[PDB]
Write a protein that binds this ligand. Structure first.
Ligand SMILES: *C/C=C(C)/C=C/C=C(C)/C=C/C1=C(C)CCCC1(C)C
Length: 137
């Protein structure tokens, strides 16, 4: 059941708390928290192959992966990492991340398309879980 589409954010929970764990400067946190409620997300899914574009005025990223194959992306705070996505269930994928260089909080993300048509993203750093909920444009 396919996640392709243009998605608009409706709620963002614990994003500032996540940025705190990641050590992001407070003045930057305020800007990023504001931008998080205005983001645009585009997904192109063909089976296990994904393209994801996340766009805001301060931050934009493009993610490319196939489920089950290691790939490179960045942590939320911008550090290059090695990632691997697996299906946890029919509708929900989970990504484990490992920094290329250095140490820091354990980070991961999940993405799920629900029965009622919401896309739910979670992003985790150590004990803090941020949840962002999207609906189709
Ligand atoms: C599967 C969906 C993924 C992996 C989405 C990742 C989205 C981000 C890493 C978003 C990051 C943002 C910032 C770093 C600051 C501006 C607000 C966000 C939420 C767009």
């Amino acid at each position: 059941p396919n996640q392709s589409g243009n998605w608009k954010i409706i709620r963002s929970e614990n994003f500032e708390e996540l940025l705190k764990v990641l050590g992001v400067n407070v003045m930057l946190r305020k800007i990023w928290v504001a931008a998080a409620s205005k983001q645009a997300v585009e997904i192109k899914q063909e089976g296990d192959t994904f393209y994801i574009k996340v766009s805001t005025t301060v931050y934009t990223t493009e993610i490319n992966f196939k489920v089950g194959e290691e790939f490179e992306e960045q942590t939320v705070d911008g550090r290059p990492c090695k990632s691997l996505v697996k299906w946890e269930s029919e509708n929900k994928m989970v990504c484990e991340q490992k920094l290329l260089k250095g140490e820091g909080p354990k980070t991961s993300w999940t993405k799920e398309l629900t029965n009622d048509g919401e896309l739910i993203l979670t992003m985790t750093a150590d004990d803090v879980v941020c949840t962002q909920v999207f609906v189709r444009e």
